[PDB]
């Protein structure tokens, strides 16, 4: 459950992330694939090399999903219904992988926004990504 303060912090942090969302998401996916190779088993039709256009496109989709989740933070379960069904009913992704991707997103945000990534902002983004992962992993 999120408070108002960390919700405002997450909104401000993502608003300052802005237009670099596609590159940030592609880098987060690359970091997850490189440091957690077991997650590569969920992408058998992909070209998981560095600088791949397919990985860049998937990162763009992931970033757009995170952006609309930021825009609809108060009502996540029904704003992410399509993604939650694809992740849970079709893909059946282990929530450990969601934790791994959240950690890699945090690492990417830390590496690309030093001034933005304060300890409070870190906590707010951690629990925002935790809420997103819980919504996507829930089966309902």
């Amino acid at each position: 459950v999120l408070s108002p303060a960390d919700k405002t912090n997450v909104k401000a942090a993502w608003g300052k992330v802005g237009a670099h969302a596609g590159e940030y998401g592609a880098e987060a996916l690359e970091r997850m694939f490189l440091s957690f190779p077991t997650t590569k088993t969920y992408f058998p039709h992909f070209d998981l090399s560095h600088g791949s256009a397919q990985v860049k496109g998937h990162g763009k989709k992931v970033a757009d999903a995170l952006t609309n989740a930021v825009a609809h933070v108060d009502d996540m379960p029904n704003a992410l219904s399509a993604l939650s069904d694809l992740h849970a009913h079709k893909l059946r992704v282990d929530p450990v992988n969601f934790k791994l991707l959240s950690h890699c997103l945090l690492v990417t945000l830390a590496a690309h926004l030093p001034a933005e990534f304060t300890p409070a902002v870190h906590a707010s983004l951690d629990k925002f990504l935790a809420s997103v992962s819980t919504v996507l992993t829930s089966k309902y």
Partner: protein, 143 residues
């Protein structure tokens, strides 16, 4: 922990530039802030209510210095991590009762702190190598 020569060289080169005095305290304070239930083990460190009070705590800074010293001692003995962290594992398991998940959380926070401090110099391969070293320290402590 098995590392490639490139990963070992990159890890050593990046750890050579790490400011211990600040990085240890940063990692410990961010652990206490992001995962507040960890303050149960550090309730004796004084004021830990707000993030500004957690990050500006001399006891937190000193303990983070000790934690980074232990991490460096482990990094110097990557092939004997289980034997290096025997006393620390006994201390954390028998006297302090710290759950093994907390070590993984602290390692992830340390990796985030390293990324924050080094920016673009913290490439995904360096992050992967540091992830495996952090996992090895956590598994050695959980033993």
């Amino acid at each position: 922990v098995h590392l490639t020569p490139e990963e070992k060289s990159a890890v050593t080169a990046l750890w050579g530039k790490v400011n211990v005095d600040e990085v240890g305290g940063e990692a410990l304070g961010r652990l206490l802030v992001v995962y507040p239930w960890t303050q149960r083990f550090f309730e004796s460190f004084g004021d830990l209510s707000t993030p500004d009070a957690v990050m500006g705590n001399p006891k937190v800074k000193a303990h983070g210095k000790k934690v980074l010293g232990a991490f460096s001692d482990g990094l110097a003995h990557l092939d004997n991590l289980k034997g290096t962290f025997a006393t620390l594992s006994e201390l954390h398991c028998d006297k302090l009762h710290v759950d093994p998940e907390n070590f993984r959380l602290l390692g992830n926070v340390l990796v985030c702190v390293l990324a924050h401090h080094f920016g673009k110099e913290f490439t995904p391969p360096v992050q992967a190598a540091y992830q495996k070293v952090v996992a090895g320290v956590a598994n050695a402590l959980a033993h």
